[PDB]
Design a protein around this ligand. Sequence first.
Ligand SMILES: Nc1ncnc2c1ncn2[C@@H]1O[C@H](COP(=O)(O)OP(=O)(O)O)[C@@H](O)[C@H]1O
Ligand SMILES: [Mg+2]
Length: 760
Amino acid sequence: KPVWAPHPTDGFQVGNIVDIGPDSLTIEPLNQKGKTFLALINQVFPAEEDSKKDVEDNCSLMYLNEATLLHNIKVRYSKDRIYTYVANILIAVNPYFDIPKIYSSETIKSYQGKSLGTMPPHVFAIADKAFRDMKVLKLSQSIIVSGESGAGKTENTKFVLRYLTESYGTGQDIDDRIVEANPLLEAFGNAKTVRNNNSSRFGKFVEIHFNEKSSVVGGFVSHYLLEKSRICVQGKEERNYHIFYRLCAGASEDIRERLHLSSPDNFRYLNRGCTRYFANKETDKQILQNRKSPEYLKAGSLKDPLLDDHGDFIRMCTAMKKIGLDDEEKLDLFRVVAGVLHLGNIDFEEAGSTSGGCNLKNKSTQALEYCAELLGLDQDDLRVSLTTRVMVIKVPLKVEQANNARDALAKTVYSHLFDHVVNRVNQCFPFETSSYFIGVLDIEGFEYFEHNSFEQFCINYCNEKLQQFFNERILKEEQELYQKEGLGVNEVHYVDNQDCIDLIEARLVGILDILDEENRLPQPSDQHFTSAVHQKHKDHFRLSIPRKSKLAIHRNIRDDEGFIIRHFAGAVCYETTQFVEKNNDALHMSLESLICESRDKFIRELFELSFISVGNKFKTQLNLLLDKLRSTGASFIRCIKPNLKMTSHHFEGAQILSQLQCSGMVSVLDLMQGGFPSRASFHELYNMYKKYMPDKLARLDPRLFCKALFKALGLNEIDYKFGLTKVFFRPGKFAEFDQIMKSDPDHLAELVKRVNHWLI
Ligand SMILES: Nc1ncnc2c1ncn2[C@@H]1O[C@H](COP(=O)(O)OP(=O)(O)O)[C@@H](O)[C@H]1O
Ligand SMILES: [Mg+2]
């Protein structure tokens, strides 16, 4: 009798149906007699009879729907059970605090070789299933960790990496290098954003490579779309990359003196953002007084259960030593970081009777000196490169143009430093050859803000391509197998998004190719590019002018000042200002030759009509990644962010419900529950057992031996279904399936003995 009906903040609330009308049901909230509210018939769902219970797999619910799914994960979350299955897919709700012992070495060991379902749901079980599938099927695997910013993708990626290296490594230094590589990549690629104190400003695919004996041989890290705009400016609640703050907070006085460092408020590239450190009562006392900004002294430290700028500087230097970085290489990295900081302090003032030129402000003399010394440049060549343009003739730059040249040089040097760090991490765990890998995908999903630039365009483009892979693997390929096998599974359909992908990436006509054309034109213009997009895709349903928007913020945006992409995740209005600049990865020749000719070998090595397409470079990287995903077995982890406050024990029902819907988790519930995640051919099963069989068993047709096997073991018509050529096992039947598949001679002989006795 009790049902789930809508609730504005909880998603759903319990009640009883007390009336029915056209397109409505009248709901009486539980224990509130006389009180009633209306709900649309299709927004009312049956509830589980027992409101207090919780199930490890949502496929075990009597009524599986969005409301019972929400309730089950809610009850589990209130008891710190953050992991729940939907058959072989994992839901992980961010706890926002460290739950004791659930990632211990002892917990790691308890998951080794255990079938799904034998142990409570855990990220360790997803990782072990990927390893066992890799080892048995002799097929490389991918683990995809998805969700909103701050949902837990990066933490779960690291749990997977730690589980696999610790369980299936050797017990040597190399095993820890894959894990120890994290403080280093996160120092240069992560930063404080309003949604996550440890936001990943780059995407990654981390592969653990194995030999034929299924033992770790090395790793490989692929990195994508490092956010370049962050290097020079941030919003008042956000910070630049962690490294700048870890260095200012933690560097010894000797390093601080050598690098001419000071409190973060003294640097343009840090002082528009938050200048405070992540610290607690203890670590705040380890930070010297000359490192603390006036705002840190007035407002105190930033609070986080994971991040600590001083502690993280120490841990990063330890991780650098552990992976094979010599003290000289560590100092070379720090010198480049400081050089970029001092570069940003180079200020300009107008010059010329019509303000057509510029000069360095006399107060930027120290900054120019420190920058040139740290980057191995001559002060005058740097000054000239930042204030003039070569075209035979050296013409003056306007202040705005000198600011852009300094910033372009800063972004390129820093991005090249990040490429060097990722390459150096790959060099610390190399492998000449391998049989298979387990790859873990950690990339930011679909995003939209009041103002959307080239960064959002690239990540949302990425999302359109990844969403298609999810649809093709989870829905299309799965159901085609069910259909070919005559299983009669109710069909779940999707609308393909090839039209939106083609709009962005098609040869010659796609947005990326139109943008590259603009960059190659004699005088590139963001307005010329946007008009060319509109003029080319006038009849395209996924594209519109910003005036067509359902919001007042886009009303004043001109046709040549933006465009709307009608992504299936929602319409996104992109402002196309700086798209041409953001699409170019190559420095002007004057800045390139300046930095290529540095006195410093390390700087020269970072760089060992100038245009390189950011969009097409990314499209090529993404197609390489998609090739790997399509050629491997896939496992999925859906990370869920419980609230927008980074707090523990605060389950925002409607926010979580929205994630369950927008992720496609709700749409596949019936498919997952009525599906068959485990399968093997009658032929392969018969062939494995055949040498252990007496004549009475071998004389049976493969399909008939399988029926005899399953009957002898007490398996029932509920647990499995026979297809045309394969036997299929239901969700929650992984242990029974694994017992059927186990190829050990003693095991095979024993099950055959049981079949012989059963037949008598
Ligand atoms: N399982 C977990 N245990 C403890 N803290 C967690 C866990 N998952 C996430 N967190 C916390 O939430 C923060 C954000 O998680 P993170 O993995 O960085 O998100 P994402 O990569 O999805 O943006 C972490 O820095 C950490 O404080
Ligand atoms: Mg992350």
